[PDB]
From a paper:
The enzymes are α/β-hydrolases with a catalytic triad typical of esterases.
Similar to the recently solved structure of MZ0003, both OtCE15A and SuCE15C differ from the fungal structures by the presence of 3 inserted regions (Reg1–3). Reg2 packs against the face of the main β-sheet, extends across an α-helix (α5 in OtCE15A and α4 in SuCE15C), and packs against Reg1 forming a contiguous unit between the two regions. Reg3 is a 15-residue hydrophilic loop found between, and packing against, the last β-strand of the main sheet and an α-helix (α9 and α8 in OtCE15A and SuCE15C, respectively). The catalytic triad (Ser/His/Glu) and most of the residues shown to interact with the glucuronoate ester moiety in the previously solved fungal StGE2 structure are conserved in OtCE15A, SuCE15C, and the previously determined MZ0003. The tryptophan residue in StGE2 (Trp310) found hydrogen bonding to the 2-OH of the ligand is conserved in the bacterial structures (Trp358 in OtCE15A, Trp348 in SuCE15C, and Trp334 in MZ003), whereas Glu267 in StGE2 which hydrogen bonds with both 2-OH and the anomeric hydroxyl group (in β configuration) is not conserved (Arg303 in SuCE15C, Val313 in OtCE15A, and Ser289 in MZ0003). In the bacterial structures, small residues are found in the equivalent leucine position (Ala359 in OtCE15A, Ser349 in SuCE15C, and Ala335 in MZ0003) while an aspartate residue is found in the same position as the isoleucine (Asp356 in OtCE15A, Asp346 in SuCE15C, and Asp332 in MZ0003). A small cleft within the pocket formed by Reg2 contains a conserved phenylalanine residue (Phe141 in OtCE15A, Phe135 in SuCE15C, and Phe117 in MZ0003) and a basic residue (Lys183 in OtCE15A, Arg173 in SuCE15C, and Arg160 in MZ0003). OtCE15A & C, and SuCE15A, further exhibited little to no discrimination between methyl esters of glucuronoate versus galacturonoate (MeGalA), contrasting especially OtCE15D and SlCE15B & C, which exhibited 107–9-fold lower kcat/Km values for MeGalA.
Numbering used by the authors: 35 to 432
Write the structure that this text describes.
Amino acid sequence: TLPDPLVGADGTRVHDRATWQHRRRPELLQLFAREVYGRTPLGRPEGMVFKVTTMEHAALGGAATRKEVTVRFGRDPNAPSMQLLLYVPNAVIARAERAPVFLGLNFYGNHTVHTDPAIALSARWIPAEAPNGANHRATEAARGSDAQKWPVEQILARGYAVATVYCGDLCPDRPDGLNASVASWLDAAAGDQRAPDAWGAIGVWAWGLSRALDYLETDPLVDASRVAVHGHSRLGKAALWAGAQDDRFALVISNESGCGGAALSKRIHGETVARINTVFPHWFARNFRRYDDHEEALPVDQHELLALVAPRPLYVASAEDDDWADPRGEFLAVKAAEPVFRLFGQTGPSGEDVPRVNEPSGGALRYHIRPGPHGMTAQDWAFYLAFADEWLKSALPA
Ligand SMILES: [Mg+2]
């Protein structure tokens, strides 16, 4: 039985957009921060520094300008940082127009998104599942190892820049990764044990996406008011929480984010709260473990996270064989968020059950399910590019 996003904490119904934006959104943001992801202790830190470390105007055979940028989270050179890779379509640059941007984290390092041998090899720890790693470090054989999830040439040809950062720059994806992470520094606690409401990996990854947007606001080649934040799987959980917390993001894409992402936790289907917290104890707040085998006690569900994106366009997608993510739960979260989108004059999927494969449904709130297993495929991206053409903030209001 789902909590109603349009009923406030005190039981009063939300009938208008101002009550939604100024009362209900803060209530939900605080519930997710306290009970699920942990508190984001601050947004933009003081003294952010942006260093363009490499710049190539004829990358990908002339199709793109490629920039690598160190985004340092404080002015002291000792402060933590992350490494942003940006490809910008040269057709757009050449016209003296700013490009819109797709921004998302990657799993195994910037060098894995494209074979491009000029990308810096990540020097950070990488997980054992990363293809062609050696002792948790990047190798030359890992270049372009994750390119199937990143159709860079097509995204550029459709007029969009591609920006990415390795999630492990922000928090390495290992159960002890928080002690190396941005959280070991921002949270800024003297003691050792993280607090019950302290953020975990998903919060730190989401924060990094907002810091990447801070960089994009300074880059004269891109339109930082037209940034689509996207993610696959655990990085799509991060993309949703980033897009919910930071309304500067113009469009949000959740590709198979599943449990603690788009899927309703109260369905108890596929991955559950207990399973995700037991296997990935660093991903959420310790407070989320209260709901292990007790999803009925959750004061929110993920449809309210989706609702926190409204009125901005939101795309949630699933894979047909990906039972662990609970595709029906991802779809039903979209349906239960739709009333908030409708309050803003937007339309969601028609249909009461999961659509047929490869048949997207919805307006600015959209869903598709594609054949096959968990992944992010060219078919997913084809649909996302069409959505961004239609619903991403325009270059005009002139
Ligand atoms: Mg589930």
